[PDB]
């Protein structure tokens, strides 16, 4: 069933190769948007995502 608690069983999710320096429609873990991807020098803490 599916009406007792929050979903803890999920189906597999596929992945696609990432591209750089090109205008694409990216989708990172449910984050959506449009733009170009390039390398950075930011110093994200280990527990931070975006």
């Amino acid at each position: 069933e599916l009406l007792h608690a929050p979903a803890t069983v999920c189906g597999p999710k596929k992945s696609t190769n990432l591209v750089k320096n090109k205008c694409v429609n990216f989708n990172f873990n449910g984050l959506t948007g449009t733009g170009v991807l390039t390398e950075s020098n930011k110093k994200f803490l280990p527990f931070q995502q975006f």
Binding site: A5, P6, T8, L45, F47
Partner: peptide
């Protein structure tokens, strides 16, 4: 305990149980 320090997250458990009271297991806290 004088000063400032931020606390980083550790875990996130999807237990979903109602909690109203708690107790510790054992010299001061």
């Amino acid at each position: 305990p004088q000063g400032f320090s931020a606390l980083e997250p550790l875990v996130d458990l999807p237990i979903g149980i109602n909690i109203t009271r708690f107790q510790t297991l054992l010299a001061a806290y």
